[model samples]
Target: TTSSPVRVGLSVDASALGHTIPPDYTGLSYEQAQMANPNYFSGANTQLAGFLRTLGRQGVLRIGGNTSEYTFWNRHREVITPEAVNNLSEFLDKTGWKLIYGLNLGKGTPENAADEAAYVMETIGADRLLAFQLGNEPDLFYRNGIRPASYDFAAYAGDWQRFFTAIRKRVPNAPFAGPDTAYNTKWLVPFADKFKHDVKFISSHYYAEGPDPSMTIERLMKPNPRLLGETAGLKQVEADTGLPFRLTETNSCYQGGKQGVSDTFAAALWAGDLMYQQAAAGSTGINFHGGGYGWYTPVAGTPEDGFIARPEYYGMLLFAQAGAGQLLGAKLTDNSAAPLLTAYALRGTDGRTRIALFNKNLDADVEVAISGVASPSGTVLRLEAPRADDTTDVTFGGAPVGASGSWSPLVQEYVPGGQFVLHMRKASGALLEFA
Candidate 1:
């Protein structure tokens, strides 16, 4: 037997549902499209449908954020419409997913929030939507002019209490989750303290870096000691609060993400490791904030309605392919080397043991060996791209993933060896399954 296999598991939080769609550069914000394509939500794209179906069957989908909670169905409160509610519900239904909807606590009054809660309960049914969050990054709302920066945590807690109390009055049986803060651990702790039993999950956001122009692929993949420290601090908050922790909104960088850092193949490697780290740290799930149409314009130009999958999207897809199961322990054989490479192992419900290897090194391939199990010389599923800094080169099942979204079927051909050698390319990931 090789060394003990590092186990991996998977979970997804899709919070960038609508807001990533940007307003046109013509400076007319009102004219922008604010909702997902009616057809897109209705299963118009067969390829997208298949993608969602795969995740649904895998049982790992959570939807929320600024967009999920505040798409603004209509100006009038009494219109009683299902356009937005039905669209999301039908999509989740088609994909076989559960839901978690966010509410607009910063902008809406408790009564308005109660109305939303009622709509979600009656329209989507309480069972379909797992829980509700009061707002998306309410801490950041203070800086955006929606609320004052001086807004006390007490005030925020009061707002949340009022919203929750009103909603509970309307839908007494509804479950709940989150403080959903951008980066305020202080608020998360006190909020969870007051409503410990009522909160199923305490959520927050994180980014390794920000909108600085100096961001690079190297910085993106390199392990940041400061981030490690901060994450450790977050764990303390989780321990103190007695709630399941979830990094509900996170990415390489926040402001539309860094051009190269967020859009390159290295992002995938970083993400793979980040997922393992979160799970290792006892995080229930990680909702990656992603989508096309950022503050920066793509070549196609910005239409608030247009949505393209970013480089991080491919990273998430790789994690999905790795599957969700019980995480096992793994250790790097070469501890002196760069820490970009992270690995995990897991035993699937089907009784097959698998390992996922991520190579975050931008300039060299890393060799990995798994112990405590027979290493199969079988075929492997590889996700790679053209360059370390390019995001558009995503591949699946050994073929380049085309715009059509078709993935080739993976074949398993065993090589006779007790050891499996992985030539993990720089800034790429691999999924190895063994019987």
Candidate 2:
């Protein structure tokens, strides 16, 4: 049963709009408690650093999550050791990625937060430190029993101000971004409104789906209405406050992520689209949250054994390869509905027009007709897997990520110009670049 290729035409507007998608847009987040080992994120950890190098030279590494609330400084070495900070400084140097250090606002004192902030500035170097987050999802503090039931935005901001003032006196002109709400976007506007002069950028977390037994690849692959709404809210916040916003923590599912769905090839498509979605909305950047090993962690492994790139990591790797310059406008000329196909175009810093296409359908292939570009032919790098749920095997450009995090394109198919029709396979993605 051969079906005719779906006739989808593309017209890319020459105008480059909004902010250029940041080069270091790809990032990873971890539980602050991971620092307890003092070796996992250290410069000495060649295995981890090697894997990180495969993603991008300059990226963001956020040290915060639920554990950040309980993780503390040297005095509270019960969690993150001082040696860990020293080691992390070396880790940042090795990876060449900036750090977003989180303070323990729930269980720690402002004085201690300032002390730790000072240590990070002196050790990590202020230039390498992107911003310091005051807390991790402070809006959930009441539900998590960290604060009283009556605690609200006003209460949270008051506590945040105390911490901010204390840290300012000790560190002097330290950068910050918060209220890192779990789902309370309402808190974002107010927090920025009240502390706009003091804060660096607005931040919030988003998860498409949560830990449910019913989670499936179909559900994960389809666009989540909530995600669209969240992106809109963030764009509005950026406009109203005139400050950039970032989805500091996000993934396929909340609550430690689902086992099969988050760890599968489906997550790659979801994550890849999520990064472009945020960038399209003019987000400063995003960080995929993960730890030692889980369905959602882009990089999975331990310091003792070694490290490996998970499916979601490939999604980021694809974006890093294709997205590096001013985002150009892409429009479907046919006006025909293709629910499973997502499209994005960018004029790279190298002066090449790169278009990314994702075929989320499991049973059908898509043929894309590209127009409105001068270059007649280009190269397409494919991201594919055995099946959507295949967890053990996933590759980008015909190459799998190595145990040490090494990856390079092994396949680059030539794409003909002038009336080109890209035959995208089921459950696969294509990054077409025009010279």
Candidate 3:
């Protein structure tokens, strides 16, 4: 057997990210607002397109939500304008990112959806739009009486069948995905079994907690076996149907997210570990949901600018920066180790084994050693932050500096040695690229 180190694969999901700047930010100048723009077609927008581009081809961009898909278009066709199309298309062109566009199923007619699908094909091309989800969180709409509460699986399946059949007729070659339900695993088997041929992938949504103020960060890091148990059933469905599963929409918490908990540095650790867990659990990808109406903004009476990256953005940054390649096997040596100190192993293309460690403890540091791997040249990249409980101290390369943006690329200095020891601060993570 060849003893050479294995290669690792890197991937990322850039979907349902609510970083768009709506019209209501109080202190957001036209320049700042434009700088924070996700609209790539507009030269004025800044946001993090450059930062996202850094992830290269491993990234998958999925655009759909209440804001991204529900907007009106000419003749009410639900078209994605070239200006808007350029935003995602440009990113894909520049970074080799894949696309998964979500359509408006709740308020849209089949004809309108067909028109939108055709327009997307014309603008971004059918090949680039990897999979098109028929709708976003259809379960919530049911509760709102958009459809009757009694609207069970049969009704939903009928609506989806009609929508998918219409889109297939219009764009027969377009790949499709969904039954994108939030907190509803019950819909997976029926939807996937019924629509397996029409659908290319199956997807679902998850949020750990509602808007409960008392939710703790520990709850975010610890493996919620309950949630995992639900996913187990979905995995079985995938196994039976042979459909790839995706957690298309997720975040620290939903219902606008708890202010202090979801927006803090602890969220970063939670996010990093959660991505690793989802991927390890056989999820094709995970799309974190946030940036809606500036959930952490303190300027009272402001109309909510609609898009702002909280501390959780830093966590995602760590994951994106670490890379998403093939999954290597790993285990925590310390059984008593806090659930926050999560790790995953993978082989890089360069033939170097890599391990990403997420230390979620906000108050204590963690010391760990790899049993099967040795880092002779130390770590390739170490992404860390300040105190475990503090969000303002979040930094990438080293110490947090005022006015330094989160997009700053992390730099590493290698030290020659068979074994290397490094300090992992509270509420931080380390991406160790071995030599």
Q: What is the lDDT of candidate 2?
A: 0.83
Worst 10 residues of 1 by lDDT: 23-32
Write down the RMSD of all candidates, one decimal each.
Answer: 8.2, 1.9, 8.9
lDDT of 2 by residue, 9-104 (tens): 777776746458887787888888898898888888998888777777778898888888788787443477678999999988888899898998
| Cα lDDT, all candidates | 0.59, 0.83, 0.59
Can you write out model 1's per-residue Cα lDDT over 1-435, one digit (the tens) per residue? 123322222221122111110111000001002234444444443444454443225333444555543454342411224565666567667766566666667666788678778877887786677678887777667666667778877888888888889999988877788777754556776777788888877777677784355677788777777667756766786688777666766777776566666766676667667776766566666666543455221111122343344455455555566565566656565634535677777664465666677777666666565555553344567777878877576665655433323345454444234465555666677777776
Off by over 4 Å in 1: 1-40, 43-47, 59-64, 67-80, 295-310, 375-377, 402-405, 410-416
User: Which tens-of-lDDT digit does each residue in 1-435 have in candidate 3?
Assistant: 112212222222222121221111001101111212345323233234443443333556666655433544333223444456556566566545567777767777877778777777876786567788876767667655466677777777888888888988888887888877753546767888888888887877777774344577767766676678767877887888888777777766766567667777777777767777777677777666533344332111111222234566566656665564566656554435444567777655456666677866555566553455555565545555545556466666553322212255447655233344445555667777766
TM-score of 3: 0.80
Question: Which prediction has more favorable lDDT, 2 or 3?
Answer: 2
Write down the TM-score of every candidate: 0.81, 0.95, 0.80
Best by lDDT: 2
> For candidate 3, what is the lDDT?
0.59
- Candidate 1 residue 180 C-alpha distance from true site, Å: 0.8
lDDT (0-100) at residue 193 of candidate 3?
81
Residue 163, candidate 2: Cα error in Å is: 0.7
Candidate 2: worst-modelled 10 consecutive residues by lDDT: 1-10
